């Protein structure tokens, strides 16, 4: 019962402004944040190691291919994207479809190299295709 009626710009802005003004109160923000701190710490601890590892391994792969500068970000981004899928839905045919779609995305929009994309997905999932 949250996304049932359409909301226009004035409605979205009114509700967002009300909630943002409310959160700016010292007591409201302090209470909410000190209550959710342990759960936030637990979620960070459960999730971020899987992505720092991907960062390090894709860095190692990128240095062997000579990628320097902001062009590394491209492949780093792709790596992280793939990892997200592996964390979200798991391994299987759905992950194959999403890997193919992400490669098409990056090759067509961002001018990525197919060979380096294969190398990144190989260091992450085990094979270029991801089967």
Whole-number minimum distance, CB 128 to DNA, in Å?
20
Size of the site for DNA (CB under 7 A): 36
Q: Can residue 74 be called a binding residue for DNA (CB under 7 A)?
A: yes
Q: Can residue 77 be called a binding residue for DNA (CB under 7 A)?
A: yes
Token pair of 79, please? 């790596």
Binding mask 108-127 for DNA (x = CB under 7 A): --x-----------------
- Determine the Cα–Cα distance for residues 16 and 10; give it in Å rounded to an integer: 10
- Determine the Cα–Cα distance for residues 93 and 81; give it in Å rounded to an integer: 17
Q: Can residue 100 be called a binding residue for DNA (CB under 7 A)?
A: no
Judged by CB, which is closer to DNA: 32, or 104? 32
Which range in 60-68, 74-82, 90-98, 122-130 contacts DNA by CB under 7 A? Answer: 74-82
Q: Can residue 43 be called a binding residue for DNA (CB under 7 A)?
A: yes
Sign of the CA dihedral running 50, 54, 55, 57? positive
Whole-number minimum distance, CB 62 to DNA, in Å?
13
């Amino acid at each position: 019962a949250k996304g049932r009626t359409p909301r226009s710009f004035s409605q979205r802005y009114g509700k967002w402004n009300a909630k943002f003004t409310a959160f700016s109160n010292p007591t409201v923000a302090s209470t909410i944040l000190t209550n959710v701190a342990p759960i936030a710490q637990g979620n960070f601890q459960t999730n971020v190691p899987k992505f720092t590892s991907v960062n390090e391994q894709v860095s190692a792969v990128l240095t062997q291919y000579g990628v320097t500068g902001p062009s590394r970000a491209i492949y780093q981004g792709y790596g992280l994207k793939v990892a997200r899928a592996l964390n979200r839905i798991g391994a299987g045919p759905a992950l194959t479809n999403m890997v193919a779609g992400l490669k098409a995305y990056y090759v067509s929009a961002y001018g990525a190299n197919p060979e380096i994309l294969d190398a990144v997905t190989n260091i992450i999932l085990g094979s270029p295709t991801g089967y």
